Design a protein around this motif. Structure first.
Motif, PDB file in Angstrom:
ATOM      1  N   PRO A  41       0.773  -1.037  -0.059  1.00  0.00           N
ATOM      2  CA  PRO A  41      -0.043   0.244   0.066  1.00  0.00           C
ATOM      3  C   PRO A  41       1.087   0.752  -0.342  1.00  0.00           C
ATOM      4  CG  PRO A  41      -0.927  -1.596   1.412  1.00  0.00           C
ATOM      5  CD  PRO A  41       0.099  -1.790   1.197  1.00  0.00           C
ATOM      6  N   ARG A  45       1.064   4.148  -2.917  1.00  0.00           N
ATOM      7  CA  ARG A  45       1.119   5.717  -2.643  1.00  0.00           C
ATOM      8  C   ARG A  45       1.122   6.442  -3.277  1.00  0.00           C
ATOM      9  NH1 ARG A  45      -0.304  10.023   2.501  1.00  0.00           N
ATOM     10  NH2 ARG A  45      -1.873  10.725   1.920  1.00  0.00           N
ATOM     11  N   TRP A  48       1.466   7.761  -6.796  1.00  0.00           N
ATOM     12  CA  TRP A  48       0.579   8.314  -6.868  1.00  0.00           C
ATOM     13  C   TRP A  48       1.008   9.954  -6.256  1.00  0.00           C
ATOM     14  CZ3 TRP A  48      -3.270  11.670  -7.001  1.00  0.00           C
ATOM     15  CH2 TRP A  48      -3.790  12.639  -5.807  1.00  0.00           C
ATOM     16  N   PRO A 142      -3.581  16.387  -2.181  1.00  0.00           N
ATOM     17  CA  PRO A 142      -4.988  16.897  -2.014  1.00  0.00           C
ATOM     18  C   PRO A 142      -5.347  16.865  -0.990  1.00  0.00           C
ATOM     19  CG  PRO A 142      -4.957  14.603  -3.080  1.00  0.00           C
ATOM     20  CD  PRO A 142      -3.640  15.328  -2.910  1.00  0.00           C
ATOM     21  N   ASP A 143      -6.690  17.093   0.219  1.00  0.00           N
ATOM     22  CA  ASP A 143      -6.998  17.162   1.080  1.00  0.00           C
ATOM     23  C   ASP A 143      -7.600  16.101   1.403  1.00  0.00           C
ATOM     24  OD1 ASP A 143      -6.979  21.251   1.344  1.00  0.00           O
ATOM     25  OD2 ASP A 143      -5.573  20.298   2.030  1.00  0.00           O
ATOM     26  N   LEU A 168      -9.402   5.516  -9.782  1.00  0.00           N
ATOM     27  CA  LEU A 168      -7.895   5.936  -9.251  1.00  0.00           C
ATOM     28  C   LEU A 168      -8.273   5.798  -7.846  1.00  0.00           C
ATOM     29  CD1 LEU A 168      -6.643   8.629 -10.622  1.00  0.00           C
ATOM     30  CD2 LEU A 168      -5.680   5.998 -10.234  1.00  0.00           C
ATOM     31  N   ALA A 171      -7.212   2.324  -4.955  1.00  0.00           N
ATOM     32  CA  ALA A 171      -6.842   2.055  -4.654  1.00  0.00           C
ATOM     33  C   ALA A 171      -6.695   2.601  -2.435  1.00  0.00           C
ATOM     34  CB  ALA A 171      -5.721   3.035  -4.562  1.00  0.00           C
ATOM     35  N   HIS A 172      -7.891   2.907  -2.503  1.00  0.00           N
ATOM     36  CA  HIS A 172      -8.071   3.175  -0.593  1.00  0.00           C
ATOM     37  C   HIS A 172      -8.935   1.810  -0.594  1.00  0.00           C
ATOM     38  CE1 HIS A 172      -7.540   7.498  -0.205  1.00  0.00           C
ATOM     39  NE2 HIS A 172      -6.364   6.927  -0.388  1.00  0.00           N
ATOM     40  N   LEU A 174      -6.487  -0.679   0.383  1.00  0.00           N
ATOM     41  CA  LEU A 174      -5.303  -0.573   0.320  1.00  0.00           C
ATOM     42  C   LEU A 174      -5.561  -0.304   1.379  1.00  0.00           C
ATOM     43  CD1 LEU A 174      -4.255  -0.368  -3.547  1.00  0.00           C
ATOM     44  CD2 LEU A 174      -4.434  -2.504  -1.617  1.00  0.00           C
ATOM     45  N   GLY A 175      -4.479  -0.250   2.302  1.00  0.00           N
ATOM     46  CA  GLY A 175      -3.838  -0.026   3.870  1.00  0.00           C
ATOM     47  C   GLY A 175      -4.694   0.592   5.114  1.00  0.00           C
ATOM     48  N   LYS A 176      -4.245   1.123   5.150  1.00  0.00           N
ATOM     49  CA  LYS A 176      -4.957   2.352   6.188  1.00  0.00           C
ATOM     50  C   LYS A 176      -4.312   3.475   6.518  1.00  0.00           C
ATOM     51  CE  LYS A 176      -4.138   1.708  11.010  1.00  0.00           C
ATOM     52  NZ  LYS A 176      -2.889   2.666  10.802  1.00  0.00           N
ATOM     53  N   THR A 177      -4.781   4.159   7.085  1.00  0.00           N
ATOM     54  CA  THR A 177      -4.976   5.819   7.684  1.00  0.00           C
ATOM     55  C   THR A 177      -3.947   5.733   9.218  1.00  0.00           C
ATOM     56  OG1 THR A 177      -6.474   6.750   8.603  1.00  0.00           O
ATOM     57  CG2 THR A 177      -6.980   6.948   6.620  1.00  0.00           C
ATOM     58  N   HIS A 178      -2.698   6.164   9.457  1.00  0.00           N
ATOM     59  CA  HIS A 178      -2.066   6.419  10.353  1.00  0.00           C
ATOM     60  C   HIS A 178      -2.657   7.569  10.834  1.00  0.00           C
ATOM     61  CE1 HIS A 178      -0.479   3.766   7.560  1.00  0.00           C
ATOM     62  NE2 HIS A 178      -0.136   2.855   8.145  1.00  0.00           N
ATOM     63  N   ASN A 181       0.979  10.693  10.158  1.00  0.00           N
ATOM     64  CA  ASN A 181       0.734  10.583   9.236  1.00  0.00           C
ATOM     65  C   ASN A 181      -0.107  11.877   8.655  1.00  0.00           C
ATOM     66  OD1 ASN A 181       2.887   9.016   9.079  1.00  0.00           O
ATOM     67  ND2 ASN A 181       1.713   7.251   7.846  1.00  0.00           N
ATOM     68  N   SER A 182      -1.525  11.263   9.142  1.00  0.00           N
ATOM     69  CA  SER A 182      -2.366  12.726   8.558  1.00  0.00           C
ATOM     70  C   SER A 182      -3.635  12.761   9.132  1.00  0.00           C
ATOM     71  CB  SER A 182      -3.082  11.417   7.062  1.00  0.00           C
ATOM     72  OG  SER A 182      -3.622  10.622   8.066  1.00  0.00           O
ATOM     73  N   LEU A 227     -12.906   8.504   4.019  1.00  0.00           N
ATOM     74  CA  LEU A 227     -11.937  10.074   4.537  1.00  0.00           C
ATOM     75  C   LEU A 227     -13.330  10.603   4.191  1.00  0.00           C
ATOM     76  CD1 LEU A 227      -8.594   9.244   2.725  1.00  0.00           C
ATOM     77  CD2 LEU A 227      -9.070  10.353   5.275  1.00  0.00           C
TER      78      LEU A 227
HETATM   79  C1  HEM Z   1      -8.807  13.325  -3.284  1.00  0.00           C
HETATM   80  C2  HEM Z   1      -8.067  12.221  -3.038  1.00  0.00           C
HETATM   81  C3  HEM Z   1      -7.264  11.308  -2.115  1.00  0.00           C
HETATM   82  C4  HEM Z   1      -7.105  12.022  -0.698  1.00  0.00           C
HETATM   83  C5  HEM Z   1      -7.032  12.696   0.251  1.00  0.00           C
HETATM   84  C6  HEM Z   1      -5.823  11.097  -0.225  1.00  0.00           C
HETATM   85  C7  HEM Z   1      -5.829  11.060   1.184  1.00  0.00           C
HETATM   86  C8  HEM Z   1      -5.233  10.007   1.764  1.00  0.00           C
HETATM   87  C9  HEM Z   1      -4.860  10.157   3.053  1.00  0.00           C
HETATM   88  C10 HEM Z   1      -5.181  11.295   3.632  1.00  0.00           C
HETATM   89  C11 HEM Z   1      -4.438   8.587   3.631  1.00  0.00           C
HETATM   90  C12 HEM Z   1      -3.370   8.337   4.838  1.00  0.00           C
HETATM   91  C13 HEM Z   1      -2.319   7.936   4.520  1.00  0.00           C
HETATM   92  C14 HEM Z   1      -1.661   7.744   6.002  1.00  0.00           C
HETATM   93  O1  HEM Z   1      -2.336   8.562   7.429  1.00  0.00           O
HETATM   94  O2  HEM Z   1      -0.478   7.335   5.893  1.00  0.00           O
HETATM   95  C15 HEM Z   1      -4.193   7.794   2.188  1.00  0.00           C
HETATM   96  C16 HEM Z   1      -3.589   6.661   2.345  1.00  0.00           C
HETATM   97  C17 HEM Z   1      -3.683   5.995   0.783  1.00  0.00           C
HETATM   98  N1  HEM Z   1      -4.229   6.444  -0.160  1.00  0.00           N
HETATM   99 FE1  HEM Z   1      -5.136   8.036  -0.236  1.00  0.00          FE
HETATM  100  N2  HEM Z   1      -5.789  10.033  -1.164  1.00  0.00           N
HETATM  101  C18 HEM Z   1      -6.572  10.272  -2.589  1.00  0.00           C
HETATM  102  C19 HEM Z   1      -6.234   9.596  -3.184  1.00  0.00           C
HETATM  103  C20 HEM Z   1      -5.509   8.189  -3.482  1.00  0.00           C
HETATM  104  C21 HEM Z   1      -5.108   8.008  -4.429  1.00  0.00           C
HETATM  105  C22 HEM Z   1      -5.703   8.749  -6.088  1.00  0.00           C
HETATM  106  C23 HEM Z   1      -4.442   7.203  -4.300  1.00  0.00           C
HETATM  107  C24 HEM Z   1      -3.325   5.741  -5.713  1.00  0.00           C
HETATM  108  C25 HEM Z   1      -4.289   5.976  -6.735  1.00  0.00           C
HETATM  109  C26 HEM Z   1      -4.419   6.742  -2.915  1.00  0.00           C
HETATM  110  C27 HEM Z   1      -3.190   5.373  -2.466  1.00  0.00           C
HETATM  111  C28 HEM Z   1      -3.115   5.378  -1.338  1.00  0.00           C
HETATM  112  C29 HEM Z   1      -2.710   4.228  -0.418  1.00  0.00           C
HETATM  113  C30 HEM Z   1      -3.166   2.756  -1.394  1.00  0.00           C
HETATM  114  C31 HEM Z   1      -3.096   4.291   0.914  1.00  0.00           C
HETATM  115  C32 HEM Z   1      -2.756   3.565   1.918  1.00  0.00           C
HETATM  116  C33 HEM Z   1      -1.526   3.730   2.378  1.00  0.00           C
HETATM  117  C34 HEM Z   1      -0.349   2.915   3.477  1.00  0.00           C
HETATM  118  O3  HEM Z   1      -1.475   2.200   4.042  1.00  0.00           O
HETATM  119  O4  HEM Z   1       0.549   2.912   4.232  1.00  0.00           O
HETATM  120  N3  HEM Z   1      -5.102   7.751  -2.792  1.00  0.00           N
HETATM  121  N4  HEM Z   1      -4.125   8.492   0.846  1.00  0.00           N
END
Ligand code: HEM
Length: 289
Positions: A41, A45, A48, A142-143, A168, A171-172, A174-178, A181-182, A227
């Motif tokens: 994951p 990210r 991306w 992005p926010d 796109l 992909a969410h 996958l994984g998690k929020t921490h 981090n965020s 989110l």
């Molecule tokens: C409006 C668009 C998006 C926003 C606001 C967003 C926001 C977030 C946030 C806040 C996290 C948590 C990060 C953390 O706390 O570690 C996250 C995780 C993730 N995002 Fe997004 N994201 C967006 C679009 C995308 C897109 C387009 C992709 C890939 C195609 C993507 C892939 C991921 C992945 C794989 C994780 C998990 C990471 C992990 O488990 O360490 N995100 N994103």
């Protein structure tokens, strides 16, 4: 501003497959990361976020330059946690020093999606490292505490339409929020690429709660979380239609995600007419490895 793809000297498919394989084998090996989610994951990210800095208006940012290696971008608050991805890729780069940074970061994401049983993502080489002064400023990513209109407008900068945005966002799954981090916490902690983002959105009983960072997020009793920008995809009726489509057609979602994700990773790059065709890497599983 033109960024013309230039193939790493003398390199061909097999060279990049070796790189893919090294990534893939390390994904399998380093399985403990993030409470056994593994690195898949965060690598997705990373790919991306290194691409999502792009601005169609002036061709600044994007994956081409490999500018995440420079401190300004590496330290972007929006990129908190991606250091783990960078560190994972470090030994890969040391083994294959000839690969460009943008090629490596993007290939990491392709490898991760594929090894997580996602769709094949065709991938093109030839990103070229550019100097520190080409690093985009912070603030282009992005926010999450926004609504559908914000999502839509934001993604126009990346030349992505509604379908591409919804695809796109899958992909969410996958994984998690921490929280550290965020400012968001939780999620399924899944490391298998599926259409479950869309299923979860439609099927779970979501509750809008405040987390320990005093931010709002949507939570279910199953332990899933969305989110505000994720949940916006079921609040806007145009996005909702697409959500439903992908919840009901795994293959369609795969095919559309693969196209959108390759596009994301290629935004800003001009491929010469006689550049190689995109590569489709075999998974470790397909190779018997
Ligand atoms: C409006 C668009 C998006 C926003 C606001 C967003 C926001 C977030 C946030 C806040 C996290 C948590 C990060 C953390 O706390 O570690 C996250 C995780 C993730 N995002 Fe997004 N994201 C967006 C679009 C995308 C897109 C387009 C992709 C890939 C195609 C993507 C892939 C991921 C992945 C794989 C994780 C998990 C990471 C992990 O488990 O360490 N995100 N994103």
């Amino acid at each position: 501003l033109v960024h013309v793809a230039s193939v790493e000297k003398g390199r061909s498919y097999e060279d990049f497959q070796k790189v893919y394989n090294a990534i893939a084998l390390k994904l399998r090996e380093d399985d403990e990361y993030d409470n056994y989610i593994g690195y898949g994951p965060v690598l997705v990210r990373l790919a991306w976020h290194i691409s999502g800095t792009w601005d169609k208006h002036d061709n600044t940012g994007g994956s081409y330059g490999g500018t995440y290696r420079f401190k300004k971008e590496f330290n972007d608050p929006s990129n908190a946690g991606l250091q783990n991805g960078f560190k994972f890729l470090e030994p890969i780069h040391k083994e294959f020093p000839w690969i460009s940074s943008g090629d490596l970061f993007s290939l990491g994401g392709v490898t991760a999606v594929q090894e997580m049983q996602g769709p094949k993502i065709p991938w093109r080489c030839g990103r070229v490292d550019t100097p520190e002064d080409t690093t985009p400023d912070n603030g282009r990513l992005p926010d999450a505490d926004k609504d559908a209109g914000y999502v839509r407008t934001f993604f126009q900068r990346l030349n992505m339409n509604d379908r591409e945005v919804v695809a796109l966002m899958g992909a969410h799954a996958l994984g998690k929020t921490h929280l550290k981090n965020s400012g968001y916490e939780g999620g399924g902690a899944n490391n298998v690429f599926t259409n479950e983002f869309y299923l979860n959105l439609l099927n779970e009983d979501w509750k809008l709660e405040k987390n320990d960072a005093n931010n709002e997020q949507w939570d279910s009793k199953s332990g899933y979380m969305m989110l505000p920008t994720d949940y916006s995809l079921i609040q806007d009726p145009k996005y909702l239609s697409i959500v439903k489509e992908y919840a009901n057609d795994q293959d369609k979602f795969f095919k559309d995600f693969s196209k959108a994700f390759e596009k994301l990773l290629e935004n800003g790059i001009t491929f010469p007419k006689d550049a190689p065709s995109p590569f489709i890497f075999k998974t470790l599983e397909e190779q018997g490895l």
